[model samples]
Target: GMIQLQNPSHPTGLLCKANQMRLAGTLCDVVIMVDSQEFHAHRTVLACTSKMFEILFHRNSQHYTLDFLSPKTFQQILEYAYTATLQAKAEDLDDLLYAAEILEIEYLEEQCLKML
Candidate 1:
């Protein structure tokens, strides 16, 4: 039989904190532009959560633009990508769902569906 060991500390939380620090410090390697507003992020973080981002990074472009999604909604999407959390106003749910679908972030899309 194999024995399992559980650690009291959550390693994922530490990684999330490090990633957040990098984001706040603008140490990211990619920029996403929506409505001409720039968002800085790690390609690895976005690509892990979004198939669209993974494919987009394959183009090797440091900067990418999106015209279909609003800056506000995209910001929320970025928040979710980095932290696995989301908060949207009642009026933003529909737009968020649409953006999630377009970005191919299935978890977010599913969450948006549950909210609706």
Candidate 2:
């Protein structure tokens, strides 16, 4: 087992370790979102419908009608994700695709593929 090198994580052993962890049954899927430190916005029918909710959460009373997370639902979840994609939150939507695969959520997985 002396086939070791300085960087065990460079490329080769990382996949090996991932496989080993899967064998040991401790890996779990998680959604990690990295926000862009820039001007960002999203849109949806829900985003427009709940005007009262927007009025409540806006930092400036004048700055209403652009809130994304002001509402939540399964469809709104997809809406936000699609909004994120449109806003360049990710270079590729496949990251979410892979998470959906890991979560065994087939419908979203397929939609992710179609999305990309």
Candidate 3:
């Protein structure tokens, strides 16, 4: 017999569930822009994961525009925010790290640097 945790200390279950929610486009209340590209995401999840997003959501703005990053790089940042893991080519880590820096996700920024 095996026991499963609903909310473990490290939060693996929630990460996986968030991925599933992302796939279904469930509970996604916010739209984000990086250059001309637009992406939809859950405000609660972003606020929970990044201080920049937390502050943004607390403000009056209903959408966010982060044009400092390219669309592909911003997609990588969103992937990590949704999945708690990143799958990227070695060359892409630098861009993703910069995105993490702007998004205020220190853990992801550190991980991106460690992989570099």
Model 3: per-residue lDDT, tens digit, 37-94? Answer: 7788888888888898898898756678886788888777778777776678888888
TM-score of each: 0.84, 0.24, 0.80
List model 2 lDDT by residue over 6-77, tens digit each. Answer: 765555465445434433534422211223212122322223423432344344332232222222222333
Task: Give per-residue lDDT, candidate 3, residue 87.
Answer: 78
Q: Model 3: which residue pairs collide?
A: none
Which residue pairs of candidate 1 clash?
none
Q: How far in Å is the alpha carbon of 90 misplaced in model 3?
A: 1.3
Clashes of each: 0, 0, 0
Q: Looking at candidate 3, what is the lDDT of residue 22?
A: 78
Candidate 2 has an lDDT of 0.38
Which regions of candidate 2 deviate over 4 angstroms? Answer: 1-92
Please identify which of the two predictions, 1 or 2, would achieve the higher lDDT against the true structure: 1
Ranking of all candidate structures by their TM-score, best first: 1, 3, 2
